[PDB]
Design a protein around this ligand. Structure first.
Ligand SMILES: Nc1ncnc2c1ncn2[C@@H]1O[C@H](COP(=O)(O)OP(=O)(O)OP(=O)(O)O)[C@@H](O)[C@H]1O
Ligand SMILES: Nc1ncnc2c1ncn2[C@@H]1O[C@H](COP(=O)(O)OP(=O)(O)OP(=O)(O)O)[C@@H](O)[C@H]1O
Ligand SMILES: Nc1ncnc2c1ncn2[C@@H]1O[C@H](COP(=O)(O)OP(=O)(O)OP(=O)(O)O)[C@@H](O)[C@H]1O
Ligand SMILES: Nc1ncnc2c1ncn2[C@@H]1O[C@H](COP(=O)(O)OP(=O)(O)OP(=O)(O)O)[C@@H](O)[C@H]1O
Ligand SMILES: [Ca+2]
Ligand SMILES: [Ca+2]
Ligand SMILES: [Ca+2]
Ligand SMILES: [Ca+2]
Ligand SMILES: [Ca+2]
Lengths: 380, 380
């Protein structure tokens, strides 16, 4: 379409977490008003929003209320059910649509969609009962990984199978939920690419980021990713094909495995701004949040050039004390805090973007701060 | 001092215009809360702030109310009551102080401060009646400019005397208000430098901007300024001298005139983020607004590296319709709109940062858009 949502209009956001907040901040710079729906009062996004609706995500009356006061609707919360999605796409303006969301919510459906797009993933099998598990183990051998098709996050609902000794735990998981078995990919680095596509079909792709997870939570994103030119260009090419084949509108985070000998496998997709793209706030010509707003409002997209190398480091509840105490050591460090009321140990409270001409110096800065010693030790 | 205002605390801003709005957005990214005082409801800053106080700038009890709900107070309105600042610095925390602002509020007092810092100004005389105007004209000759000592913005309260024929208009101005007459400098370029100094005395200087005015309102800022490295170094050294001699805490904008022989005359000072510093939002490692917040909260200052060449173009009320209509043509352009509810011909509604590797291509982009045909017709 050529449908444009002009500055001055209201953008409605389903989900009031940090992703919503950062969307709202970028939209405010451009003169947009913001409405947000979230089940808890005073969410990070509500602190920036003009209008706040406190309600469950599955409350259709409240979704309708959000839509009826918004000129365009988007989401950070992905688990919107079909009845709400169909209503939104037909009776509100939801340029992102429902089709991509439905593919990314189920690991089996997601992998099917990626292969149909022509892109490589780990060899996988659907597991709906004990016999399918047995057949899958015999076909894919060891090592392999069993994951729940839905609801899985932070490595939960996941069993790695290294030998027959692991089968018992795998059977327990498969007893409890629909699963997929994937062949274990021996990779060197986990990487991600944020890709943007506007309503009118303009596309932009951000640089490849190298992602380091510790205890199933992202710790650092490094840009440029420390991978060969071959791996880099391949990752970017794959992300574009995905955007094109999936008919993306908005933002798509493509998480990948990169092997020593130059292969990329697509691991999973997120149809929203993503933690591995927070680096863009300080290091790129446009942030993933500014791009997201432009894409859904059908404005011309900004450029995605990396202006300075960067290390994004996540700030969890366990880190917030150390961050405030070390505040006067934060030279070259660009702090972002989400305004969450309560710190919980593993809850994401913010992040810091460490900019430097040299990635290793940025990495050394994170270390020398001694805030993430816990994460550092687990990596050692 | 070593007083630090930590993220999570409330920053109070006196003045709800676009400068406060942009301070608030940068503060919110770092997790600060915002309170604002403005005489008009729904101001640009109130649209982002957590707390809004609607009141006059002289309403002591409202200023008192703001101080009570803030951990630190800053100003945005350059024409603030004064004495109210003397209340604030003694009974609350106003790290900027009152002394610098009071000096810059009066052109005569301003000129004295600059001269006492050892820097050049246009030769000037105080004018309080017709006899003094007559004597000043005799001494300074033509061309010269008569300016009100207080209340001058957008070229208001000024009469340029090119010949004796302009004296009649100047005489009317001199009766209306206290004025200074100064020599008219035949500069090659106008430049500005934004200098930042924190509570602990850390000092950062932004790159020199080349500024183009039309009808005494800023039209374009160009960075890097198209000047010799020698003039650039001079301008920066001048800004550091002023920051130190005026004992700056916070932001200081320094407008300068550059003549063919390579000389710099200081035109005026502004103890706040400045229109000529808006380019920093998109083109520098840190924006002037993020820097200002860091300065007053006593956090380490960010780097001021220019990450890409930029042309900032002001969007006035006369331009808003054109911007919205030509919104699809804004590739390479980073739009900021301030949320002002009422448009007036010369009122500042927003700005656009045009980023490009080549400064001349950016300048050509502004022309090709034809949004500022009026400005380009008046320039040639
Ligand atoms: N096929 C595979 N081969 C090798 N390692 C894998 C495979 N699948 C998953 N992993 C490992 O398990 C980790 C988590 O799995 P996954 O990518 O499904 O994320 P998740 O469990 O949804 O958690 P998150 O919330 O971080 O996305 C990955 O980062 C990767 O290191
Ligand atoms: N239990 C859950 N299951 C699925 N999604 C969740 C859950 N809890 C929170 N979310 C969603 O996760 C998003 C925030 O993602 P976050 O930044 O924590 O990690 P991420 O962007 O998925 O990166 P990673 O892949 O490393 O986990 C929000 O959209 C939020 O609604
Ligand atoms: N996409 C999602 N699918 C399922 N549940 C979700 C999703 N997003 C959020 N939730 C639920 O909402 C809760 C809070 O959301 P989220 O995890 O994004 O914020 P948080 O700041 O991490 O809070 P907490 O640390 O309490 O989980 C989660 O614990 C989860 O139960
Ligand atoms: N002495 C001078 N010689 C030559 N040109 C001058 C002189 N004084 C002012 N000008 C021109 O007029 C413009 C506006 O002057 P000045 O900065 O004093 O106005 P102002 O209204 O106080 O500015 P602001 O809108 O920034 O508050 C200058 O940028 C310059 O172009
Ligand atoms: Ca996942
Ligand atoms: Ca996660
Ligand atoms: Ca993931
Ligand atoms: Ca002035
Ligand atoms: Ca001026």
């Amino acid at each position: 379409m050529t449908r444009i949502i002009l500055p001055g209009k209201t953008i409605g956001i389903i989900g009031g977490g940090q992703l919503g907040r950062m969307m709202a901040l970028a939209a405010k710079e451009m003169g947009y008003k913001i409405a947000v729906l979230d089940p808890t009062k005073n969410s990070p996004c509500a602190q920036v929003a003009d209008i706040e609706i406190v309600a469950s995500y599955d409350d259709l009356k409240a979704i309708q209320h959000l839509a009826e006061i918004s000129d365009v609707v988007t989401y950070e919360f992905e688990n919107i059910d079909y009845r709400c999605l169909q209503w939104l796409e037909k009776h509100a303006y939801l340029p992102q649509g429902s089709q991509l969301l439905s593919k990314t919510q189920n690991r089996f459906t997601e992998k099917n969609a990626i292969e149909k797009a022509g892109l490589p993933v780990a060899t996988y099998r659907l597991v709906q009962n004990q016999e399918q598990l047995t057949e899958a183990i015999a076909e894919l051998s060891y090592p392999s990984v069993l994951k729940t098709t839905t609801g899985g996050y932070d490595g939960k609902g996941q069993v790695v199978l290294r030998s027959e000794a692991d089968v018992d735990e795998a059977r327990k998981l498969a007893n409890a939920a629909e699963c997929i078995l994937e062949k274990w990919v021996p990779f060197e680095k986990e990487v991600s690419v944020i890709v943007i596509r506007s309503v009118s079909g303009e596309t932009k792709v951000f640089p490849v980021a190298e992602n380091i997870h510790v205890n199933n939570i992202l710790h650092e994103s490094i840009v440029p990713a420390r991978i060969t030119e071959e791996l880099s260009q391949k990752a970017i090419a794959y992300a574009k094909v995905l955007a094109d084949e999936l008919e993306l509108v908005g933002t798509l985070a493509v998480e990948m495995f990169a092997t020593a000998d130059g292969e990329i496998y697509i691991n999973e997709l997120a149809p929203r701004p993503h933690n591995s793209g927070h680096y863009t706030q300080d290091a790129c010509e446009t942030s993933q949040f500014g791009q997201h707003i432009r894409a859904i409002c059908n404005l011309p997209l900004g450029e995605t050039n990396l202006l300075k190398p960067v290390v994004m480091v996540n700030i969890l509840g366990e880190h917030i004390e150390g961050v405030l105490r070390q505040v006067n050591r934060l030279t070259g460090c660009y702090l972002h805090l989400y305004g969450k009321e309560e710190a919980k140990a593993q809850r994401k409270m913010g992040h810091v973007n460490i900019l430097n001409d040299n990635i290793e110096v940025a990495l050394e800065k994170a270390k020398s701060l001694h805030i993430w010693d816990h994460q550092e030790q687990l990596l050692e």
